[PDB]
Amino acid sequence: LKNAXEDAXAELXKAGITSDFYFNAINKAKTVEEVNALKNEILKAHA
């Protein structure tokens, strides 16, 4: 059910990101909207 953590996790694993700020933002993100926003932004930026 709550896969939006491991999705945003594995995707940023695949994208090759290891930046502490975005990791903190992603894991601190309590709402999935933030997760989608952060992930889609940085993923598109590192696609």
Side-chain angles (χ1 to χ4, degrees):
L1 299 175
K2 187 172 180 56
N3 56 28
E6 186 173 282
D7 179 81
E11 286 299 276
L12 307 186
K14 187 179 184 59
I17 305 173
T18 43
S19 309
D20 55 277
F21 175 81
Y22 288 122
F23 279 25
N24 175 86
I26 292 292
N27 288 93
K28 189 182 184 301
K30 184 183 181 302
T31 54
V32 179
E33 189 64 66
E34 301 175 274
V35 174
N36 292 336
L38 299 164
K39 189 194 75 168
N40 292 333
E41 199 292 297
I42 63 183
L43 184 65
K44 187 183 183 301
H46 290 276

mmCIF file of all heavy atoms in Angstrom:
data_model
loop_
_atom_site.group_PDB
_atom_site.id
_atom_site.type_symbol
_atom_site.label_atom_id
_atom_site.label_comp_id
_atom_site.label_asym_id
_atom_site.label_seq_id
_atom_site.Cartn_x
_atom_site.Cartn_y
_atom_site.Cartn_z
ATOM 1 N N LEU A 1 0.846 -1.216 0.000
ATOM 2 C CA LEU A 1 0.000 0.000 0.000
ATOM 3 C C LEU A 1 0.871 1.252 0.000
ATOM 4 O O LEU A 1 0.811 2.065 -0.922
ATOM 5 C CB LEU A 1 -0.931 -0.002 1.216
ATOM 6 C CG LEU A 1 -1.915 -1.174 1.277
ATOM 7 C CD1 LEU A 1 -2.696 -1.148 2.579
ATOM 8 C CD2 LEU A 1 -2.865 -1.140 0.090
ATOM 9 N N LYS A 2 1.696 1.394 1.026
ATOM 10 C CA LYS A 2 2.582 2.542 1.140
ATOM 11 C C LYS A 2 3.891 2.264 0.401
ATOM 12 O O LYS A 2 4.903 1.924 1.012
ATOM 13 C CB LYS A 2 2.841 2.846 2.622
ATOM 14 C CG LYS A 2 3.617 4.130 2.869
ATOM 15 C CD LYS A 2 3.669 4.466 4.350
ATOM 16 C CE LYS A 2 4.434 5.754 4.608
ATOM 17 N NZ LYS A 2 3.879 6.897 3.835
ATOM 18 N N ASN A 3 3.857 2.389 -0.922
ATOM 19 C CA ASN A 3 5.023 2.081 -1.750
ATOM 20 C C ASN A 3 5.656 3.341 -2.337
ATOM 21 O O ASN A 3 6.707 3.271 -2.966
ATOM 22 C CB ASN A 3 4.642 1.113 -2.892
ATOM 23 C CG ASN A 3 3.503 1.625 -3.769
ATOM 24 O OD1 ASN A 3 3.303 2.830 -3.923
ATOM 25 N ND2 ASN A 3 2.749 0.710 -4.363
ATOM 26 N N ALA A 4 5.021 4.488 -2.112
ATOM 27 C CA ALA A 4 5.421 5.738 -2.763
ATOM 28 C C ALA A 4 6.840 6.161 -2.395
ATOM 29 O O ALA A 4 7.668 6.409 -3.271
ATOM 30 C CB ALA A 4 4.439 6.848 -2.425
ATOM 31 N N UNK A 5 7.122 6.231 -1.104
ATOM 32 C CA UNK A 5 9.248 5.606 0.022
ATOM 33 C C UNK A 5 10.072 4.714 -0.905
ATOM 34 O O UNK A 5 11.091 5.169 -1.438
ATOM 35 C CB UNK A 5 8.468 6.650 -0.724
ATOM 36 N N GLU A 6 9.669 3.467 -1.120
ATOM 37 C CA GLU A 6 10.478 2.511 -1.873
ATOM 38 C C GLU A 6 10.464 2.816 -3.369
ATOM 39 O O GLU A 6 11.436 2.538 -4.067
ATOM 40 C CB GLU A 6 9.996 1.081 -1.598
ATOM 41 C CG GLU A 6 10.857 -0.007 -2.224
ATOM 42 C CD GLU A 6 10.438 -1.391 -1.781
ATOM 43 O OE1 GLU A 6 10.785 -1.786 -0.647
ATOM 44 O OE2 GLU A 6 9.752 -2.089 -2.557
ATOM 45 N N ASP A 7 9.370 3.384 -3.865
ATOM 46 C CA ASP A 7 9.312 3.800 -5.263
ATOM 47 C C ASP A 7 10.267 4.958 -5.496
ATOM 48 O O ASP A 7 11.218 4.839 -6.273
ATOM 49 C CB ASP A 7 7.888 4.215 -5.658
ATOM 50 C CG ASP A 7 7.799 4.686 -7.095
ATOM 51 O OD1 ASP A 7 7.725 3.827 -7.999
ATOM 52 O OD2 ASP A 7 7.787 5.915 -7.326
ATOM 53 N N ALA A 8 10.022 6.057 -4.787
ATOM 54 C CA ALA A 8 10.839 7.258 -4.898
ATOM 55 C C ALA A 8 12.312 6.939 -4.732
ATOM 56 O O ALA A 8 13.091 7.041 -5.681
ATOM 57 C CB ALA A 8 10.412 8.293 -3.869
ATOM 58 N N UNK A 9 12.695 6.525 -3.537
ATOM 59 C CA UNK A 9 14.239 4.709 -3.049
ATOM 60 C C UNK A 9 14.865 4.007 -4.228
ATOM 61 O O UNK A 9 16.033 4.228 -4.559
ATOM 62 C CB UNK A 9 14.070 6.206 -3.293
ATOM 63 N N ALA A 10 14.060 3.181 -4.886
ATOM 64 C CA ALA A 10 14.499 2.422 -6.042
ATOM 65 C C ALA A 10 14.741 3.319 -7.250
ATOM 66 O O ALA A 10 15.707 3.121 -7.987
ATOM 67 C CB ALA A 10 13.470 1.358 -6.387
ATOM 68 N N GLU A 11 13.866 4.297 -7.465
ATOM 69 C CA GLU A 11 13.989 5.164 -8.629
ATOM 70 C C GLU A 11 15.209 6.074 -8.522
ATOM 71 O O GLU A 11 15.963 6.210 -9.482
ATOM 72 C CB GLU A 11 12.715 5.985 -8.853
ATOM 73 C CG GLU A 11 11.563 5.158 -9.404
ATOM 74 C CD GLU A 11 11.891 4.542 -10.747
ATOM 75 O OE1 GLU A 11 11.736 5.236 -11.775
ATOM 76 O OE2 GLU A 11 12.306 3.364 -10.781
ATOM 77 N N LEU A 12 15.416 6.683 -7.361
ATOM 78 C CA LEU A 12 16.573 7.556 -7.168
ATOM 79 C C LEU A 12 17.861 6.741 -7.117
ATOM 80 O O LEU A 12 18.825 7.033 -7.834
ATOM 81 C CB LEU A 12 16.434 8.389 -5.888
ATOM 82 C CG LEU A 12 15.137 9.192 -5.763
ATOM 83 C CD1 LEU A 12 15.189 10.091 -4.540
ATOM 84 C CD2 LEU A 12 14.872 10.010 -7.018
ATOM 85 N N UNK A 13 17.876 5.713 -6.276
ATOM 86 C CA UNK A 13 18.966 3.560 -6.850
ATOM 87 C C UNK A 13 19.226 3.594 -8.355
ATOM 88 O O UNK A 13 20.387 3.582 -8.768
ATOM 89 C CB UNK A 13 19.092 4.910 -6.205
ATOM 90 N N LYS A 14 18.191 3.645 -9.187
ATOM 91 C CA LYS A 14 18.349 3.541 -10.636
ATOM 92 C C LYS A 14 18.918 4.825 -11.247
ATOM 93 O O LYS A 14 19.819 4.766 -12.083
ATOM 94 C CB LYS A 14 17.000 3.199 -11.280
ATOM 95 C CG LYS A 14 17.075 2.906 -12.773
ATOM 96 C CD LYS A 14 15.704 2.553 -13.338
ATOM 97 C CE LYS A 14 15.776 2.165 -14.809
ATOM 98 N NZ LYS A 14 16.669 0.996 -15.035
ATOM 99 N N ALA A 15 18.396 5.975 -10.834
ATOM 100 C CA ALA A 15 18.814 7.255 -11.406
ATOM 101 C C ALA A 15 20.261 7.594 -11.054
ATOM 102 O O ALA A 15 20.923 8.346 -11.769
ATOM 103 C CB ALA A 15 17.881 8.376 -10.964
ATOM 104 N N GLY A 16 20.746 7.037 -9.950
ATOM 105 C CA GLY A 16 22.132 7.232 -9.575
ATOM 106 C C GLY A 16 22.330 8.488 -8.758
ATOM 107 O O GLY A 16 23.295 9.226 -8.958
ATOM 108 N N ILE A 17 21.415 8.730 -7.837
ATOM 109 C CA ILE A 17 21.472 9.910 -6.993
ATOM 110 C C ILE A 17 21.913 9.516 -5.588
ATOM 111 O O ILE A 17 21.493 8.481 -5.073
ATOM 112 C CB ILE A 17 20.096 10.617 -6.927
ATOM 113 C CG1 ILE A 17 19.591 10.944 -8.334
ATOM 114 C CG2 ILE A 17 20.182 11.892 -6.095
ATOM 115 C CD1 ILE A 17 18.185 11.492 -8.349
ATOM 116 N N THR A 18 22.786 10.318 -4.988
ATOM 117 C CA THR A 18 23.248 10.082 -3.626
ATOM 118 C C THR A 18 23.389 11.403 -2.875
ATOM 119 O O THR A 18 24.307 11.586 -2.075
ATOM 120 C CB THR A 18 24.601 9.342 -3.608
ATOM 121 O OG1 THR A 18 25.479 9.905 -4.596
ATOM 122 C CG2 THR A 18 24.425 7.850 -3.865
ATOM 123 N N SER A 19 22.473 12.324 -3.140
ATOM 124 C CA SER A 19 22.535 13.652 -2.548
ATOM 125 C C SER A 19 21.699 13.706 -1.270
ATOM 126 O O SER A 19 20.505 13.392 -1.273
ATOM 127 C CB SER A 19 22.052 14.691 -3.559
ATOM 128 O OG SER A 19 22.724 14.528 -4.797
ATOM 129 N N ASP A 20 22.348 14.127 -0.191
ATOM 130 C CA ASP A 20 21.773 14.081 1.150
ATOM 131 C C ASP A 20 20.516 14.942 1.287
ATOM 132 O O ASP A 20 19.587 14.571 2.012
ATOM 133 C CB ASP A 20 22.821 14.501 2.193
ATOM 134 C CG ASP A 20 23.426 15.864 1.913
ATOM 135 O OD1 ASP A 20 24.364 15.949 1.090
ATOM 136 O OD2 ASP A 20 22.977 16.857 2.518
ATOM 137 N N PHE A 21 20.475 16.071 0.589
ATOM 138 C CA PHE A 21 19.344 16.995 0.700
ATOM 139 C C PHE A 21 18.059 16.372 0.154
ATOM 140 O O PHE A 21 17.008 16.424 0.800
ATOM 141 C CB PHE A 21 19.642 18.323 -0.021
ATOM 142 C CG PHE A 21 18.473 19.277 -0.040
ATOM 143 C CD1 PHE A 21 18.194 20.076 1.062
ATOM 144 C CD2 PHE A 21 17.649 19.370 -1.154
ATOM 145 C CE1 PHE A 21 17.118 20.946 1.051
ATOM 146 C CE2 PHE A 21 16.570 20.237 -1.167
ATOM 147 C CZ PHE A 21 16.306 21.024 -0.065
ATOM 148 N N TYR A 22 18.145 15.766 -1.025
ATOM 149 C CA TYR A 22 16.965 15.194 -1.661
ATOM 150 C C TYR A 22 16.545 13.906 -0.965
ATOM 151 O O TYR A 22 15.359 13.626 -0.850
ATOM 152 C CB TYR A 22 17.184 14.954 -3.162
ATOM 153 C CG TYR A 22 17.223 16.229 -3.991
ATOM 154 C CD1 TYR A 22 18.332 16.553 -4.772
ATOM 155 C CD2 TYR A 22 16.137 17.103 -4.008
ATOM 156 C CE1 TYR A 22 18.355 17.709 -5.533
ATOM 157 C CE2 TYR A 22 16.158 18.257 -4.769
ATOM 158 C CZ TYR A 22 17.267 18.554 -5.528
ATOM 159 O OH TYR A 22 17.286 19.700 -6.291
ATOM 160 N N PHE A 23 17.517 13.138 -0.485
ATOM 161 C CA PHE A 23 17.214 11.941 0.301
ATOM 162 C C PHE A 23 16.429 12.318 1.551
ATOM 163 O O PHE A 23 15.409 11.700 1.869
ATOM 164 C CB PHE A 23 18.499 11.204 0.701
ATOM 165 C CG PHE A 23 19.085 10.329 -0.375
ATOM 166 C CD1 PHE A 23 18.841 10.577 -1.719
ATOM 167 C CD2 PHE A 23 19.884 9.247 -0.037
ATOM 168 C CE1 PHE A 23 19.381 9.767 -2.695
ATOM 169 C CE2 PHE A 23 20.425 8.436 -1.012
ATOM 170 C CZ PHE A 23 20.172 8.694 -2.342
ATOM 171 N N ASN A 24 16.905 13.346 2.249
ATOM 172 C CA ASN A 24 16.222 13.846 3.436
ATOM 173 C C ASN A 24 14.812 14.315 3.084
ATOM 174 O O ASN A 24 13.853 13.979 3.773
ATOM 175 C CB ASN A 24 17.025 14.986 4.088
ATOM 176 C CG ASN A 24 16.300 15.634 5.262
ATOM 177 O OD1 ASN A 24 16.396 15.168 6.397
ATOM 178 N ND2 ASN A 24 15.591 16.729 5.009
ATOM 179 N N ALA A 25 14.688 15.068 1.990
ATOM 180 C CA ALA A 25 13.387 15.567 1.554
ATOM 181 C C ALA A 25 12.424 14.422 1.245
ATOM 182 O O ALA A 25 11.260 14.453 1.648
ATOM 183 C CB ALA A 25 13.538 16.468 0.335
ATOM 184 N N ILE A 26 12.924 13.405 0.548
ATOM 185 C CA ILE A 26 12.099 12.279 0.125
ATOM 186 C C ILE A 26 11.627 11.457 1.320
ATOM 187 O O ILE A 26 10.445 11.136 1.427
ATOM 188 C CB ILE A 26 12.858 11.367 -0.871
ATOM 189 C CG1 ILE A 26 13.088 12.091 -2.200
ATOM 190 C CG2 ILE A 26 12.100 10.067 -1.110
ATOM 191 C CD1 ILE A 26 11.820 12.343 -2.990
ATOM 192 N N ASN A 27 12.539 11.129 2.226
ATOM 193 C CA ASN A 27 12.180 10.294 3.370
ATOM 194 C C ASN A 27 11.417 11.086 4.426
ATOM 195 O O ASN A 27 10.672 10.509 5.217
ATOM 196 C CB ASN A 27 13.412 9.624 3.990
ATOM 197 C CG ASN A 27 13.976 8.521 3.107
ATOM 198 O OD1 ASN A 27 14.868 8.756 2.291
ATOM 199 N ND2 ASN A 27 13.458 7.307 3.259
ATOM 200 N N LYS A 28 11.586 12.405 4.440
ATOM 201 C CA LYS A 28 10.844 13.242 5.380
ATOM 202 C C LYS A 28 9.450 13.548 4.839
ATOM 203 O O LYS A 28 8.523 13.792 5.610
ATOM 204 C CB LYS A 28 11.587 14.548 5.676
ATOM 205 C CG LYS A 28 10.966 15.352 6.807
ATOM 206 C CD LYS A 28 11.703 16.658 7.041
ATOM 207 C CE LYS A 28 11.142 17.408 8.240
ATOM 208 N NZ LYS A 28 9.702 17.728 8.069
ATOM 209 N N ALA A 29 9.316 13.537 3.513
ATOM 210 C CA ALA A 29 8.031 13.765 2.855
ATOM 211 C C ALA A 29 6.946 12.868 3.447
ATOM 212 O O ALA A 29 6.973 11.648 3.278
ATOM 213 C CB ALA A 29 8.159 13.523 1.358
ATOM 214 N N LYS A 30 6.007 13.473 4.163
ATOM 215 C CA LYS A 30 4.945 12.717 4.819
ATOM 216 C C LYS A 30 3.776 12.488 3.863
ATOM 217 O O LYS A 30 3.029 11.517 4.002
ATOM 218 C CB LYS A 30 4.468 13.446 6.086
ATOM 219 C CG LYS A 30 3.424 12.676 6.885
ATOM 220 C CD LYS A 30 2.940 13.473 8.087
ATOM 221 C CE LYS A 30 1.922 12.694 8.907
ATOM 222 N NZ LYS A 30 0.741 12.288 8.099
ATOM 223 N N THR A 31 3.630 13.369 2.883
ATOM 224 C CA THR A 31 2.558 13.240 1.911
ATOM 225 C C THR A 31 3.123 12.835 0.551
ATOM 226 O O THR A 31 4.185 13.307 0.137
ATOM 227 C CB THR A 31 1.751 14.552 1.782
ATOM 228 O OG1 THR A 31 2.620 15.656 1.487
ATOM 229 C CG2 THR A 31 0.970 14.837 3.060
ATOM 230 N N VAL A 32 2.404 11.943 -0.132
ATOM 231 C CA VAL A 32 2.847 11.383 -1.407
ATOM 232 C C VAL A 32 2.993 12.470 -2.477
ATOM 233 O O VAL A 32 3.789 12.334 -3.406
ATOM 234 C CB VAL A 32 1.874 10.286 -1.907
ATOM 235 C CG1 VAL A 32 2.323 9.718 -3.243
ATOM 236 C CG2 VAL A 32 1.750 9.164 -0.885
ATOM 237 N N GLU A 33 2.230 13.552 -2.336
ATOM 238 C CA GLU A 33 2.312 14.681 -3.261
ATOM 239 C C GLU A 33 3.734 15.248 -3.289
ATOM 240 O O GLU A 33 4.272 15.554 -4.360
ATOM 241 C CB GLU A 33 1.317 15.772 -2.850
ATOM 242 C CG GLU A 33 1.164 16.893 -3.870
ATOM 243 C CD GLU A 33 0.584 16.410 -5.184
ATOM 244 O OE1 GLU A 33 -0.593 15.997 -5.200
ATOM 245 O OE2 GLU A 33 1.298 16.455 -6.209
ATOM 246 N N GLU A 34 4.345 15.357 -2.109
ATOM 247 C CA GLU A 34 5.707 15.865 -1.995
ATOM 248 C C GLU A 34 6.672 14.889 -2.642
ATOM 249 O O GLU A 34 7.589 15.285 -3.355
ATOM 250 C CB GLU A 34 6.096 16.065 -0.526
ATOM 251 C CG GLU A 34 5.212 17.036 0.233
ATOM 252 C CD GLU A 34 5.567 17.096 1.702
ATOM 253 O OE1 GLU A 34 5.051 16.263 2.482
ATOM 254 O OE2 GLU A 34 6.370 17.972 2.088
ATOM 255 N N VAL A 35 6.434 13.606 -2.398
ATOM 256 C CA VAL A 35 7.257 12.546 -2.958
ATOM 257 C C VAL A 35 7.250 12.614 -4.480
ATOM 258 O O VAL A 35 8.305 12.610 -5.113
ATOM 259 C CB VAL A 35 6.770 11.154 -2.501
ATOM 260 C CG1 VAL A 35 7.540 10.054 -3.210
ATOM 261 C CG2 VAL A 35 6.904 11.007 -0.995
ATOM 262 N N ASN A 36 6.056 12.697 -5.057
ATOM 263 C CA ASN A 36 5.914 12.793 -6.506
ATOM 264 C C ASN A 36 6.610 14.040 -7.031
ATOM 265 O O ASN A 36 7.336 13.979 -8.021
ATOM 266 C CB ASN A 36 4.437 12.816 -6.934
ATOM 267 C CG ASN A 36 3.722 11.495 -6.697
ATOM 268 O OD1 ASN A 36 4.353 10.439 -6.626
ATOM 269 N ND2 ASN A 36 2.396 11.532 -6.612
ATOM 270 N N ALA A 37 6.411 15.164 -6.350
ATOM 271 C CA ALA A 37 6.988 16.431 -6.783
ATOM 272 C C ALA A 37 8.512 16.354 -6.809
ATOM 273 O O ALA A 37 9.146 16.624 -7.837
ATOM 274 C CB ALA A 37 6.532 17.560 -5.870
ATOM 275 N N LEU A 38 9.082 15.962 -5.679
ATOM 276 C CA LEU A 38 10.529 15.870 -5.532
ATOM 277 C C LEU A 38 11.106 14.847 -6.504
ATOM 278 O O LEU A 38 12.052 15.147 -7.236
ATOM 279 C CB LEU A 38 10.893 15.488 -4.091
ATOM 280 C CG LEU A 38 10.441 16.475 -3.009
ATOM 281 C CD1 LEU A 38 10.496 15.818 -1.641
ATOM 282 C CD2 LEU A 38 11.310 17.722 -3.023
ATOM 283 N N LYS A 39 10.508 13.654 -6.531
ATOM 284 C CA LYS A 39 11.025 12.563 -7.345
ATOM 285 C C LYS A 39 10.979 12.923 -8.820
ATOM 286 O O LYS A 39 11.983 12.823 -9.508
ATOM 287 C CB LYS A 39 10.239 11.267 -7.123
ATOM 288 C CG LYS A 39 10.884 10.063 -7.798
ATOM 289 C CD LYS A 39 9.954 8.859 -7.861
ATOM 290 C CE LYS A 39 8.868 9.027 -8.917
ATOM 291 N NZ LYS A 39 8.151 7.750 -9.180
ATOM 292 N N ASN A 40 9.815 13.354 -9.299
ATOM 293 C CA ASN A 40 9.649 13.660 -10.718
ATOM 294 C C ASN A 40 10.589 14.781 -11.144
ATOM 295 O O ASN A 40 11.147 14.742 -12.243
ATOM 296 C CB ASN A 40 8.195 14.037 -11.052
ATOM 297 C CG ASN A 40 7.233 12.863 -10.924
ATOM 298 O OD1 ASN A 40 7.626 11.704 -11.068
ATOM 299 N ND2 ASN A 40 5.959 13.146 -10.669
ATOM 300 N N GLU A 41 10.781 15.766 -10.271
ATOM 301 C CA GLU A 41 11.677 16.877 -10.569
ATOM 302 C C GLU A 41 13.108 16.366 -10.742
ATOM 303 O O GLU A 41 13.689 16.471 -11.828
ATOM 304 C CB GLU A 41 11.613 17.926 -9.448
ATOM 305 C CG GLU A 41 12.131 19.311 -9.834
ATOM 306 C CD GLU A 41 13.623 19.353 -10.090
ATOM 307 O OE1 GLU A 41 14.399 19.092 -9.149
ATOM 308 O OE2 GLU A 41 14.029 19.646 -11.237
ATOM 309 N N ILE A 42 13.655 15.780 -9.684
ATOM 310 C CA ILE A 42 15.056 15.371 -9.682
ATOM 311 C C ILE A 42 15.317 14.225 -10.658
ATOM 312 O O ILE A 42 16.395 14.135 -11.253
ATOM 313 C CB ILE A 42 15.540 14.983 -8.269
ATOM 314 C CG1 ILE A 42 14.779 13.768 -7.729
ATOM 315 C CG2 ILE A 42 15.380 16.163 -7.327
ATOM 316 C CD1 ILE A 42 15.160 13.399 -6.311
ATOM 317 N N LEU A 43 14.327 13.365 -10.840
ATOM 318 C CA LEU A 43 14.444 12.261 -11.780
ATOM 319 C C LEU A 43 14.530 12.806 -13.194
ATOM 320 O O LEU A 43 15.395 12.406 -13.968
ATOM 321 C CB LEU A 43 13.257 11.302 -11.652
ATOM 322 C CG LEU A 43 13.318 10.055 -12.532
ATOM 323 C CD1 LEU A 43 14.485 9.172 -12.122
ATOM 324 C CD2 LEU A 43 12.008 9.290 -12.443
ATOM 325 N N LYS A 44 13.652 13.750 -13.520
ATOM 326 C CA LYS A 44 13.687 14.384 -14.829
ATOM 327 C C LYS A 44 15.000 15.144 -15.007
ATOM 328 O O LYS A 44 15.544 15.220 -16.108
ATOM 329 C CB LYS A 44 12.497 15.330 -15.010
ATOM 330 C CG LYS A 44 12.380 15.896 -16.413
ATOM 331 C CD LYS A 44 11.229 16.877 -16.527
ATOM 332 C CE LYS A 44 11.076 17.392 -17.949
ATOM 333 N NZ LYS A 44 12.307 18.072 -18.433
ATOM 334 N N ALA A 45 15.518 15.685 -13.907
ATOM 335 C CA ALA A 45 16.775 16.425 -13.937
ATOM 336 C C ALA A 45 17.975 15.495 -14.110
ATOM 337 O O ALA A 45 19.034 15.925 -14.570
ATOM 338 C CB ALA A 45 16.933 17.262 -12.673
ATOM 339 N N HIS A 46 17.824 14.230 -13.728
ATOM 340 C CA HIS A 46 18.920 13.265 -13.856
ATOM 341 C C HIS A 46 18.572 12.119 -14.801
ATOM 342 O O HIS A 46 19.225 11.074 -14.784
ATOM 343 C CB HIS A 46 19.322 12.710 -12.485
ATOM 344 C CG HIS A 46 20.016 13.718 -11.620
ATOM 345 N ND1 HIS A 46 21.367 13.967 -11.703
ATOM 346 C CD2 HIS A 46 19.539 14.554 -10.666
ATOM 347 C CE1 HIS A 46 21.691 14.909 -10.840
ATOM 348 N NE2 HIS A 46 20.603 15.282 -10.199
ATOM 349 N N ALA A 47 17.536 12.307 -15.607
ATOM 350 C CA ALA A 47 17.182 11.340 -16.633
ATOM 351 C C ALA A 47 18.173 11.404 -17.791
ATOM 352 O O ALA A 47 17.993 12.166 -18.738
ATOM 353 C CB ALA A 47 15.766 11.591 -17.132
#
